[PDB]
Design a protein around this ligand. Sequence first.
Ligand SMILES: [Ca+2]
Ligand SMILES: [Ca+2]
Ligand SMILES: [Ca+2]
Ligand SMILES: [Ca+2]
Ligand SMILES: [Zn+2]
Ligand SMILES: [Zn+2]
Ligand SMILES: [Zn+2]
Ligand SMILES: [Zn+2]
Lengths: 8, 421, 418
Amino acid sequence: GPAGPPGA
Amino acid sequence: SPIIKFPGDVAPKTDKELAVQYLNTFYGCPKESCNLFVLKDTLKKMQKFFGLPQTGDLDQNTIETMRKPRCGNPDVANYNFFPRKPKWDKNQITYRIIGYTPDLDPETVDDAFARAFQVWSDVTPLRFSRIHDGEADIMINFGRWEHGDGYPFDGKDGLLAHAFAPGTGVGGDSHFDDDELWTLGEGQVVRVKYGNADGEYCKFPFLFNGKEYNSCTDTGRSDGFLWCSTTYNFEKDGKYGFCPHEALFTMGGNAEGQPCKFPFRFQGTSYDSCTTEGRTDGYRWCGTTEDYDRDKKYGFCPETAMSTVGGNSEGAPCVFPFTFLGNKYESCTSAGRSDGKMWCATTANYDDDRKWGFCPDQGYSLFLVAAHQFGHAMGLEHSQDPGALMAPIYTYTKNFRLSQDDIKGIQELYGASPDID
Amino acid sequence: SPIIKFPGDVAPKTDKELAVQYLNTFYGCPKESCNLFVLKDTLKKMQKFFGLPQTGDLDQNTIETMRKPRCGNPDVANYNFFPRKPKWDKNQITYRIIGYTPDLDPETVDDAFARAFQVWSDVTPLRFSRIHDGEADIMINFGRWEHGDGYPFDGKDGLLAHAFAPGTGVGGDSHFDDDELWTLGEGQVVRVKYGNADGEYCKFPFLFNGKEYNSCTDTGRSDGFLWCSTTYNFEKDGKYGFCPHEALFTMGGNAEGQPCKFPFRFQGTSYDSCTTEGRTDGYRWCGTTEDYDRDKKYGFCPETAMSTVGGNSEGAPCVFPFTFLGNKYESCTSAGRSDGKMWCATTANYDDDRKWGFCPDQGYSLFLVAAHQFGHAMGLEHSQDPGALMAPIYTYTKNFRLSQDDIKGIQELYGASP
Ligand SMILES: [Ca+2]
Ligand SMILES: [Ca+2]
Ligand SMILES: [Ca+2]
Ligand SMILES: [Ca+2]
Ligand SMILES: [Zn+2]
Ligand SMILES: [Zn+2]
Ligand SMILES: [Zn+2]
Ligand SMILES: [Zn+2]
């Protein structure tokens, strides 16, 4: 989705 | 006029509980016995250290200092390490990037850690060398809160990183808080993909169609891909490119640029984001299908374009313009805040939906923060000279230069570079 | 109706596609070179092995047996060029469990392996001791498809397990296909917690409200917690318990019996299910919060209750009656495939919602399959005696008993019980 999948 | 509390913001700790954790973390004040008098003595050690007045009271000049972003390492000695005063029994050290940060692409990071290391290599015999396999002298890694060593982190800002002194085990390991907006010091850094300027960094802010954009935008497109200008004036210079983002496109693998499929099942676990699971290189990758194991199609997620930070909107992009309490907004603001934090609504108007997020700020130059962290890995400790790289508190410096104090410090420890002829 | 391709399902294999793979994995038939006289000569080595009419062709006799759940090890040896005819050089062997299956509770699994080891010691001077940290002689783990050894599994049914002959490295290792409905041989198992029978297995089927239940239900419950009767007649005996799940509750940790939170972030990754990430004892856990790092709240996931298996309904029970291809069904059907496996829509209508799941079958005994695998872990190979535990095709035997073939085989290796 734009934003991005949570996580780093 | 109104300064309201946003529905979702990270709860500011009390001046008291802020001083307790600070003295406890950087001073040694007894974790549970840091009550009034026993802290007053300590509080003054903190005060002495910084330029503050040794009152021993929680005066504003103090709590103001305690509130600034800074390193994770302490300012006091572990009440005198008889056995210790670190050194690298060698002038040839080896490091290894165990893991990365999505804020930056692998190369930028790799380079930063490189440049950080040269800083000390320029004035000492010390020579650094990256290795890709097995244990290294200095093992670099990114983590959040508690990450495996009982010296946890704390969320955006506050502690930024830390490193252990020279030695075995975790000796020399440098750890950076994975909850920071890792940059090169002057705002979000995103390296463009494809477009007429592949490999150049998005240039924030950039001027496009009479508008200024301080982050990648999907304006002018219907495929929903985020792009940006690699220069300021998009009209004059027509350079632009695509911003990384795993929900859009992968980088490598065998999925041929298809976006990550969340959640995707890998063995007994369903990942909802990119992982490094089953990898050693610390390169995130993901399943571009709903069952990696079944159809081994996958891609890599080398970076991520941050629309918004914190808030409630899970990263959802700002929406311009947006209405906040009868006043229309066309940019980020501090309206309704206090602190200094710039935010925006991630929906048309805020009042109706009440969904917001913080606008990415200046973040912390990985180069500077790392350079410092490595100073420790070599054995150096905090200096009180606020201009010295080894100072506790973080400060951005357009063009860095090692402080005399630092040069005097690393060299008294390793000696100067050898005078050849 | 024709044969329809269901969502998320695997792609069917043809009768020939199958045979060729089967003779490739199990017979050494060269993939690209397994055709014409080679497929014929090979087909026959296989038909002989399973005592089929040595036709040499792909005939309803051979095929039928080719699609029976069987062990993932070869039937043809090579142990000439494959290193020395194996055999632990010591009677004191150690096994470590590095992974489990959500199908059975840690204990029930731990036992099943234990009982399976005991099956070899009972007749030989061999002793097995579980260890909880380090490199054991026999490492037991569950995995799917390619699970890190070049010998991939295949999803539901088919190859059920595999193990390596005694030796250093991966030698002795026994791996299990995680895509299988692991059971004790008689269908799904669910050890219940709390209630008035905590520690008891669910009794399927069980009768409640004048009705049969072959899985847990939230029926007659308002909170939606899953339960089941631990005895058949729920009236003559009022014992029952609540069935596990990570969506309802958790065990241990500090979560205090709270559900998991999917997804929940753990360092640079978002987990949409329990995981063992971090642990070194295969125990499944999950954040019971949205940020495990921040909240430090977590709980274990010891076993998952299933009312349906596989599919896209992630476990959700069937819906009777349901509508498929315009027609209505009041029971599990096979309508739509070539493999005759029973499936059901998890919603009154399928066509529009397209949500389906496999009606759970009898599954495979972890005991027996483990028993089998440990046989290889000790140096044994497949038997042509259908009785022998070492026969490749799987077969449920309630009253399991080593074959005279097996006892001879294992102890011509190690010798008999001292
Ligand atoms: Ca080290
Ligand atoms: Ca921090
Ligand atoms: Ca071994
Ligand atoms: Ca299988
Ligand atoms: Zn520091
Ligand atoms: Zn650390
Ligand atoms: Zn076998
Ligand atoms: Zn395997």
